[PDB]
Amino acid sequence: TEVVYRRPEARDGTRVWELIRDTGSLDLNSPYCYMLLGDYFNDTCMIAEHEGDIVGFISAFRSPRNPETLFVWQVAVASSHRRQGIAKAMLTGLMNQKACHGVRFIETTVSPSNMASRRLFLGYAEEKSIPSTVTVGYGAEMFPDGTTHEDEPLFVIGPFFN
Amino acid sequence: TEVVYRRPEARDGTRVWELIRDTGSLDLNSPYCYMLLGDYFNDTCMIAEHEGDIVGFISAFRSPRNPETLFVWQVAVASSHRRQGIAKAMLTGLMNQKACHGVRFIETTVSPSNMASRRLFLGYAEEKSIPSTVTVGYGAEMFPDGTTHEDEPLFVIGPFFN
Numbered sequence: 001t002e003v004v005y006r007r008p009e010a011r012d013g014t015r016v017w018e019l020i021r022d023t024g025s026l027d028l029n030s031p032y033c034y035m036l037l038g039d040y041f042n043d044t045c046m047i048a049e050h051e052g053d054i055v056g057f058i059s060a061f062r063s064p065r066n067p068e069t070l071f072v073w074q075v076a077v078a079s080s081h082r083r084q085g086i087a088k089a090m091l092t093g094l095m096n097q098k099a100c101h102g103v104r105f106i107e108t109t110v111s112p113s114n115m116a117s118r119r120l121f122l123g124y125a126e127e128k129s130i131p132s133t134v135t136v137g138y139g140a141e142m143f144p145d146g147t148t149h150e151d152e153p154l155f156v157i158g159p160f161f162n
Numbered sequence: 163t164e165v166v167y168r169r170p171e172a173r174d175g176t177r178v179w180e181l182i183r184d185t186g187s188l189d190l191n192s193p194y195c196y197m198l199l200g201d202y203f204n205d206t207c208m209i210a211e212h213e214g215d216i217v218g219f220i221s222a223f224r225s226p227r228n229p230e231t232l233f234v235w236q237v238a239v240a241s242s243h244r245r246q247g248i249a250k251a252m253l254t255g256l257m258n259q260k261a262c263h264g265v266r267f268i269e270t271t272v273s274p275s276n277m278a279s280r281r282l283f284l285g286y287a288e289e290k291s292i293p294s295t296v297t298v299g300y301g302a303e304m305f306p307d308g309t310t311h312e313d314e315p316l317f318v319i320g321p322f323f324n
């Protein structure tokens with residue numbers, strides 16, 4: 001049976017946090033963070049559902065200083081649903097949303113070992129004939145001593161319209 | 163010597179995360195989250211510094227659906243600097259920022275056991291003669307099973323201008 005796509009709600013916050021946590025690899029925010037996103041940012045976020053389980057999430061916001069830029073924060077797809085095109089469908093759903101009107105750039109950061117995200121963003125640009133630019137973003141050394149976190153290179157997609 | 167107040171930067175992200183973590187009580191987001199706030203949201207955030215240490219932080223954003231409302235996310239003051247008026251000075255600094263122009267409401271959520279925040283927001287409204295309204299916000303049951311998190315009642319301050 002099919003995968004369903006919708007805007008999240010504050011009450012999804014806990015299941016979103018579970019998804020992110022079960023991924024193992026991703027930077028995990030507080031459950032409250034996911035509720036706020038469900039509440040205040042849900043016009044520019046996306047959930048994927050299959051047989052009533054959350055199997056995908058994208059969080060994004062429009063940059064407050066430069067609202068023509070959408071920043072994509074997290075992309076998560078459950079293990080059990082890899083390689084079925086879900087990340088690509090979320091991102092495409094998201095850019096179709098009415099709250100993405102007037103956006104001319106996508107901006108995001110992709111960790112070295114996140115190869116799905118690298119593929120998603122480069123492929124999105126390539127399939128739509130939009131420029132993509134990759135530069136130094138945040139360095140590993142900006143992260144706290146206890147952990148060992150990777151670099152977060154910056155990806156800018158565009159200009160385009162909408 | 164005095165406490166200094168400024169907008170944060172992406173490179174403060176790690177020290178902000180340390181402050182939040184050392185507080186013990188607060189919902190801790192990922193270091194990356196604090197960097198994004200330093201980067202994309204810093205016009206509506208605030209740092210407090212004393213003898214080059216971070217001793218206070220406020221995070222906020224303008225609601226994307228209702229940009230006349232500022233939502234205040236986290237308020238943190240280091241243990242060692244309680245009861246010296248820092249939270250009040252941050253919040254007052256923040257509302258003076260040029261990116262708070264045209265704001266007519268403050269909205270936030272305060273946990274039951276966070277008595278400093280309760281005092282800050284109720285006192286801010288009372289000192290400025292602005293209405294304050296308190297209602298049910300997020301319930302404890304919306305949080306994940308493993309933890310035991312409290313309610314987050316909603317505080318709305320206003321209308322006012324600016």
Ligand code: NA
Nearest residue numbers: 104159160161
């Ligand atoms: Na354009």
Ligand code: NA
Nearest residue numbers: 266321322323
């Ligand atoms: Na007003």
